[PDB]
Design an enzyme around this catalytic site. Structure first.
Site, PDB file in Angstrom:
ATOM      1  CG  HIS A 127     -12.881 -28.042 -34.033  1.00  0.00           C
ATOM      2  ND1 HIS A 127     -13.686 -27.260 -33.219  1.00  0.00           N
ATOM      3  CD2 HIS A 127     -12.146 -29.059 -33.389  1.00  0.00           C
ATOM      4  CE1 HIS A 127     -13.658 -28.067 -31.910  1.00  0.00           C
ATOM      5  NE2 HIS A 127     -12.533 -29.131 -32.331  1.00  0.00           N
TER       6      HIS A 127
ATOM      7  CG  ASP B 190     -15.290 -24.592 -33.327  1.00  0.00           C
ATOM      8  OD1 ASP B 190     -15.699 -24.925 -34.525  1.00  0.00           O
ATOM      9  OD2 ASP B 190     -14.631 -25.092 -32.289  1.00  0.00           O
TER      10      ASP B 190
ATOM     11  N   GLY C 137     -11.134 -35.466 -28.388  1.00  0.00           N
ATOM     12  CA  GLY C 137     -12.272 -36.258 -28.782  1.00  0.00           C
ATOM     13  C   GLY C 137     -13.669 -35.838 -28.305  1.00  0.00           C
TER      14      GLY C 137
ATOM     15  CB  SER D 222     -14.002 -31.559 -30.560  1.00  0.00           C
ATOM     16  OG  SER D 222     -12.938 -31.133 -30.243  1.00  0.00           O
ATOM     17  N   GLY D 223     -17.222 -30.805 -30.242  1.00  0.00           N
ATOM     18  CA  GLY D 223     -18.317 -30.723 -30.794  1.00  0.00           C
ATOM     19  C   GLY D 223     -19.488 -31.555 -29.941  1.00  0.00           C
TER      20      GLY D 223
END
Ligand SMILES: CC1=N[C@H](c2cn(S(=O)(=O)c3ccccc3Cl)c3ccc(C)cc23)CN1
Ligand SMILES: [Cl-]
Ligand SMILES: [Cl-]
Length: 224
Positions: free
Chosen positions: A41, A83, A174, A176-177
Protein backbone atom coordinates in the site's frame (compact mmCIF):
# COMPACT_ATOMS: atom_id res chain seq x y z
CA UNK A 1 4.20 4.98 17.01
CA UNK A 2 1.73 5.54 19.92
CA UNK A 3 3.08 5.33 23.46
CA UNK A 4 6.54 4.32 22.37
CA UNK A 5 10.13 5.22 23.16
CA UNK A 6 13.04 6.51 21.11
CA UNK A 7 14.77 3.45 19.58
CA UNK A 8 18.26 2.90 20.84
CA UNK A 9 21.08 4.19 18.64
CA UNK A 10 22.35 1.31 16.38
CA UNK A 11 19.63 -1.19 17.29
CA UNK A 12 17.57 -0.65 14.06
CA UNK A 13 20.11 -0.44 11.22
CA UNK A 14 17.68 -1.97 8.80
CA UNK A 15 14.98 0.74 9.16
CA UNK A 16 14.53 2.94 6.13
CA UNK A 17 12.21 5.84 5.34
CA UNK A 18 10.45 5.91 2.06
CA UNK A 19 10.10 9.55 1.15
CA UNK A 20 7.85 11.30 -1.31
CA UNK A 21 10.23 14.04 -2.26
CA UNK A 22 11.35 15.04 1.24
CA UNK A 23 8.36 14.02 3.13
CA UNK A 24 7.71 10.75 4.99
CA UNK A 25 5.48 8.37 3.05
CA UNK A 26 6.18 4.96 4.72
CA UNK A 27 8.76 2.96 6.65
CA UNK A 28 10.56 0.01 5.15
CA UNK A 29 13.23 -2.51 5.92
CA UNK A 30 16.48 -3.25 4.31
CA UNK A 31 16.92 -6.84 3.28
CA UNK A 32 19.94 -6.66 1.02
CA UNK A 33 22.30 -3.93 -0.26
CA UNK A 34 19.94 -3.39 -3.20
CA UNK A 35 16.55 -4.24 -1.75
CA UNK A 36 13.96 -2.83 0.61
CA UNK A 37 10.83 -4.66 1.84
CA UNK A 38 7.70 -2.67 2.68
CA UNK A 39 3.92 -2.80 2.37
CA UNK A 40 2.23 -2.98 -1.03
CA UNK A 41 0.00 0.00 0.00
CA UNK A 42 3.07 2.18 0.13
CA UNK A 43 3.76 1.94 -3.60
CA UNK A 44 4.70 5.05 -5.56
CA UNK A 45 6.22 5.65 -8.97
CA UNK A 46 9.46 6.59 -7.22
CA UNK A 47 10.86 7.03 -3.80
CA UNK A 48 13.77 8.59 -2.09
CA UNK A 49 14.98 6.04 0.39
CA UNK A 50 16.63 7.36 3.54
CA UNK A 51 19.09 4.97 5.18
CA UNK A 52 21.49 4.96 8.16
CA UNK A 53 19.86 7.42 10.56
CA UNK A 54 17.32 7.51 13.37
CA UNK A 55 16.40 11.06 12.43
CA UNK A 56 13.80 11.60 9.69
CA UNK A 57 14.93 13.99 6.95
CA UNK A 58 18.51 13.87 8.27
CA UNK A 59 20.66 15.78 5.83
CA UNK A 60 23.70 13.63 6.52
CA UNK A 61 22.03 10.34 5.89
CA UNK A 62 22.34 8.45 2.65
CA UNK A 63 19.47 8.94 0.30
CA UNK A 64 19.09 6.56 -2.67
CA UNK A 65 16.44 6.94 -5.30
CA UNK A 66 14.27 3.95 -6.28
CA UNK A 67 11.87 3.58 -9.13
CA UNK A 68 11.11 -0.20 -9.41
CA UNK A 69 8.59 -1.85 -7.16
CA UNK A 70 7.48 -5.46 -7.04
CA UNK A 71 4.20 -6.07 -5.28
CA UNK A 72 3.02 -9.44 -4.44
CA UNK A 73 0.49 -10.10 -7.24
CA UNK A 74 -2.27 -11.00 -4.77
CA UNK A 75 -2.31 -7.60 -3.10
CA UNK A 76 -5.83 -6.40 -2.54
CA UNK A 77 -6.97 -2.81 -2.25
CA UNK A 78 -10.25 -4.09 -0.90
CA UNK A 79 -9.39 -6.77 1.64
CA UNK A 80 -5.73 -5.76 2.22
CA UNK A 81 -4.39 -9.30 1.90
CA UNK A 82 -0.81 -9.70 0.56
CA UNK A 83 0.20 -6.27 1.64
CA UNK A 84 3.92 -6.77 0.81
CA UNK A 85 6.30 -5.29 -1.74
CA UNK A 86 9.96 -5.24 -2.64
CA UNK A 87 11.60 -2.07 -3.86
CA UNK A 88 14.91 -2.14 -5.85
CA UNK A 89 17.35 0.65 -5.11
CA UNK A 90 18.99 2.56 -8.04
CA UNK A 91 22.34 2.12 -6.27
CA UNK A 92 23.56 -0.27 -3.57
CA UNK A 93 23.87 0.93 -0.03
CA UNK A 94 27.14 0.64 1.83
CA UNK A 95 26.89 -1.25 5.14
CA UNK A 96 28.09 0.30 8.47
CA UNK A 97 27.18 0.52 12.14
CA UNK A 98 24.13 2.42 10.93
CA UNK A 99 23.16 0.38 7.92
CA UNK A 100 22.58 -3.42 7.88
CA UNK A 101 19.99 -5.85 6.45
CA UNK A 102 17.57 -7.47 8.76
CA UNK A 103 17.51 -11.25 9.01
CA UNK A 104 14.57 -12.77 7.11
CA UNK A 105 12.61 -15.41 9.07
CA UNK A 106 13.10 -19.12 8.71
CA UNK A 107 10.09 -19.98 10.81
CA UNK A 108 6.92 -18.30 12.08
CA UNK A 109 7.21 -17.11 15.66
CA UNK A 110 4.22 -18.18 17.80
CA UNK A 111 1.71 -16.22 19.84
CA UNK A 112 3.12 -14.60 22.98
CA UNK A 113 6.55 -13.93 21.36
CA UNK A 114 8.05 -10.51 22.31
CA UNK A 115 8.66 -8.16 19.40
CA UNK A 116 9.46 -4.58 18.56
CA UNK A 117 8.03 -2.36 15.82
CA UNK A 118 9.65 0.94 14.73
CA UNK A 119 8.67 4.00 12.71
CA UNK A 120 8.49 7.74 12.24
CA UNK A 121 4.70 7.74 12.23
CA UNK A 122 2.56 9.96 14.34
CA UNK A 123 2.77 9.63 18.14
CA UNK A 124 -0.78 10.86 18.62
CA UNK A 125 -4.14 10.17 16.95
CA UNK A 126 -6.33 11.41 15.53
CA UNK A 127 -4.52 14.75 15.92
CA UNK A 128 -1.08 14.00 14.35
CA UNK A 129 2.33 14.81 15.77
CA UNK A 130 5.28 13.60 13.71
CA UNK A 131 8.54 12.92 15.50
CA UNK A 132 12.16 13.46 14.47
CA UNK A 133 13.57 10.35 16.19
CA UNK A 134 12.72 6.78 15.17
CA UNK A 135 10.24 5.52 17.73
CA UNK A 136 9.81 1.90 19.01
CA UNK A 137 6.98 -0.05 20.57
CA UNK A 138 7.34 -3.35 22.31
CA UNK A 139 4.42 -5.69 21.42
CA UNK A 140 3.66 -9.41 21.58
CA UNK A 141 2.17 -11.62 18.88
CA UNK A 142 -1.54 -12.38 19.28
CA UNK A 143 -3.05 -15.59 17.90
CA UNK A 144 -5.54 -15.46 15.05
CA UNK A 145 -8.27 -16.72 17.25
CA UNK A 146 -7.82 -13.90 19.77
CA UNK A 147 -7.32 -11.32 17.06
CA UNK A 148 -10.54 -12.42 15.36
CA UNK A 149 -12.50 -11.39 18.41
CA UNK A 150 -11.65 -7.82 17.41
CA UNK A 151 -11.40 -7.95 13.61
CA UNK A 152 -13.56 -10.98 12.67
CA UNK A 153 -13.75 -11.61 8.93
CA UNK A 154 -11.29 -8.78 8.13
CA UNK A 155 -8.31 -10.93 9.13
CA UNK A 156 -6.69 -13.02 6.49
CA UNK A 157 -4.56 -16.15 6.77
CA UNK A 158 -1.28 -14.24 6.35
CA UNK A 159 -2.00 -11.34 8.56
CA UNK A 160 -0.31 -11.24 11.92
CA UNK A 161 -1.60 -9.39 14.99
CA UNK A 162 0.49 -7.83 17.81
CA UNK A 163 -0.12 -5.60 20.81
CA UNK A 164 -0.10 -5.46 24.59
CA UNK A 165 -3.32 -6.13 26.57
CA UNK A 166 -4.85 -2.94 27.88
CA UNK A 167 -2.09 -0.74 26.48
CA UNK A 168 -2.12 1.95 23.83
CA UNK A 169 1.39 1.11 22.52
CA UNK A 170 0.96 0.60 18.78
CA UNK A 171 1.52 1.67 15.21
CA UNK A 172 -0.08 4.62 13.42
CA UNK A 173 -0.08 6.74 10.17
CA UNK A 174 3.47 6.90 8.70
CA UNK A 175 4.58 3.67 10.36
CA UNK A 176 3.18 1.60 7.37
CA UNK A 177 5.65 -0.75 5.75
CA UNK A 178 8.02 -0.73 8.78
CA UNK A 179 9.52 -3.78 10.52
CA UNK A 180 8.13 -5.95 13.31
CA UNK A 181 11.20 -7.86 14.59
CA UNK A 182 10.87 -10.82 17.02
CA UNK A 183 13.77 -12.99 18.28
CA UNK A 184 16.15 -11.35 15.79
CA UNK A 185 14.05 -12.00 12.61
CA UNK A 186 11.62 -9.91 10.59
CA UNK A 187 8.20 -11.34 11.44
CA UNK A 188 5.92 -8.46 10.24
CA UNK A 189 5.46 -5.40 8.09
CA UNK A 190 3.19 -2.71 9.45
CA UNK A 191 -0.14 -2.96 7.49
CA UNK A 192 -3.10 -1.56 9.31
CA UNK A 193 -5.03 -1.28 12.63
CA UNK A 194 -7.98 0.64 14.02
CA UNK A 195 -8.34 4.34 13.68
CA UNK A 196 -7.94 6.35 15.75
CA UNK A 197 -4.72 4.57 16.61
CA UNK A 198 -3.62 3.31 19.98
CA UNK A 199 -6.95 2.22 21.44
CA UNK A 200 -6.32 -0.44 24.10
CA UNK A 201 -7.12 -3.94 22.91
CA UNK A 202 -7.10 -3.06 19.19
CA UNK A 203 -4.16 -5.03 17.89
CA UNK A 204 -1.90 -3.76 15.14
CA UNK A 205 -2.16 -5.81 11.93
CA UNK A 206 0.99 -6.82 10.03
CA UNK A 207 1.86 -8.82 6.96
CA UNK A 208 3.22 -12.11 8.19
CA UNK A 209 6.62 -12.29 6.60
CA UNK A 210 7.31 -16.02 7.27
CA UNK A 211 4.47 -16.87 4.85
CA UNK A 212 6.26 -15.09 1.98
CA UNK A 213 9.78 -16.60 2.18
CA UNK A 214 9.65 -18.15 -1.30
CA UNK A 215 8.24 -15.08 -2.94
CA UNK A 216 10.77 -12.73 -1.33
CA UNK A 217 13.71 -14.95 -2.33
CA UNK A 218 12.45 -15.60 -5.88
CA UNK A 219 11.67 -12.01 -6.58
CA UNK A 220 15.24 -10.98 -5.36
CA UNK A 221 17.19 -13.67 -7.21
CA UNK A 222 20.34 -12.35 -8.86
CA UNK A 223 21.32 -15.71 -10.49
CA UNK A 224 19.67 -18.76 -12.15
C1 LIG B 1 -3.42 -1.70 4.00
C2 LIG B 1 -3.54 -0.22 4.22
N1 LIG B 1 -3.10 0.36 5.26
C3 LIG B 1 -3.38 1.81 5.26
C4 LIG B 1 -4.02 2.27 6.52
C5 LIG B 1 -3.34 3.04 7.47
N2 LIG B 1 -4.21 3.07 8.52
S1 LIG B 1 -3.87 3.89 9.94
O1 LIG B 1 -5.06 4.50 10.48
O2 LIG B 1 -2.93 4.94 9.71
C6 LIG B 1 -3.27 2.87 11.07
C7 LIG B 1 -4.05 2.56 12.19
C8 LIG B 1 -3.58 1.65 13.13
C9 LIG B 1 -2.33 1.07 12.98
C10 LIG B 1 -1.55 1.38 11.88
C11 LIG B 1 -2.00 2.29 10.94
CL1 LIG B 1 -0.93 2.69 9.57
C12 LIG B 1 -5.23 2.16 8.36
C13 LIG B 1 -6.29 1.71 9.14
C14 LIG B 1 -7.17 0.75 8.63
C15 LIG B 1 -7.01 0.24 7.34
C16 LIG B 1 -7.96 -0.79 6.81
C17 LIG B 1 -5.93 0.66 6.57
C18 LIG B 1 -5.04 1.57 7.11
C19 LIG B 1 -4.28 1.92 3.99
N3 LIG B 1 -4.19 0.59 3.42
CL1 LIG C 1 -2.85 1.05 -2.77
CL1 LIG D 1 4.14 -3.82 -8.65
Amino acid sequence: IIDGYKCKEGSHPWQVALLKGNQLHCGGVLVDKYWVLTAAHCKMGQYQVQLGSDKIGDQSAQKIKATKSFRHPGYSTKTHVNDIMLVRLDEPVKMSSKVEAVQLPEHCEPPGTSCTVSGWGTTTSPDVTFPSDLMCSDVKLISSRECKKVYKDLLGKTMLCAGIPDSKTNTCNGDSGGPLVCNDTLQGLVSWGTYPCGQPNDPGVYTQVCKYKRWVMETMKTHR
